[PDB]
Design a protein around this ligand. Structure first.
Ligand SMILES: O=C1NCCc2c(OCCCCN3CCCCC3)cccc21
Ligand SMILES: [Zn+2]
Length: 199
């Protein structure tokens, strides 16, 4: 379908060269997309749309929804139980939030853990070309998003806001990131199974 070709194009076209030279996510310019599955979880969808309507009413009738990537070793728990801020802690650049990227390759750096962890479970390789990885392409309600350049360890959204947008700066994020502090503000719409490809 064209819906899945659209997802594959967003996955491929948003790849960037990383500052760490591929340390966290592996060395690649493109992916081998194996499968794209649409997640249909009615209870999670309703939790998401209920919150989306509330945020829209608090943001000049505008949800400020975006399709963003999310990488995690816990993709299976997310598709069944949803995103959960109780699993977030203060240690990230913007604190105890749930993080998303507009660049698929940035989300790919988190699939095997923080900084890629020890890589794939079978080969302990962050640049594994063999093992199949999974990323989520998500509907995310940003609402009134607080723009920030430097570290600001939050527990919750800033007063009057619904999310934080980390913008690139000198010393300094290389790429944007989007952070929510309520799990119901994202819906894991597509589950993408893929491999990174050797350049
Ligand atoms: O796709 C993403 N997944 C999570 C991390 C992430 C980014 O932020 C790194 C911030 C460190 C704190 N995180 C929360 C708890 C454990 C994982 C790391 C930025 C953009 C996308 C993502
Ligand atoms: Zn492997």
């Amino acid at each position: 379908d064209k819906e899945f070709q659209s997802v594959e194009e967003e996955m491929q076209s948003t790849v960037r060269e990383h500052r760490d030279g591929g340390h966290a996510g592996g060395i690649f310019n493109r992916y081998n997309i194996l499968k794209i599955q649409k997640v249909c979880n009615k209870k999670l969808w309703e939790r998401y749309t209920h919150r989306r309507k509330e945020v829209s009413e608090e943001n000049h009738n505008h949800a400020n929804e975006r399709m963003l990537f999310h990488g995690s070793p816990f993709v299976n728990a997310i598709i069944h139980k949803g995103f959960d801020e109780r699993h977030a802690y203060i240690g990230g650049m913007f604190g105890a939030g749930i993080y998303f990227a507009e660049n698929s390759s940035k989300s790919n750096q988190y699939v095997y853990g923080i900084g890629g962890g020890t890589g794939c479970p079978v080969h302990k390789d962050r640049s594994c070309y063999i093992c199949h990885r999974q990323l989520l392409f998500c509907r995310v309600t940003l609402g009134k998003s607080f723009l920030q350049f430097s570290a600001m360890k939050m527990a919750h959204s800033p007063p009057g806001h619904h999310s934080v947008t980390g913008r690139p700066s000198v010393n300094g994020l290389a790429l944007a990131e989007y952070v929510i502090y309520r799990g119901e503000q994202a819906y894991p719409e597509y589950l993408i199974t893929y491999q990174i490809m050797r350049p």
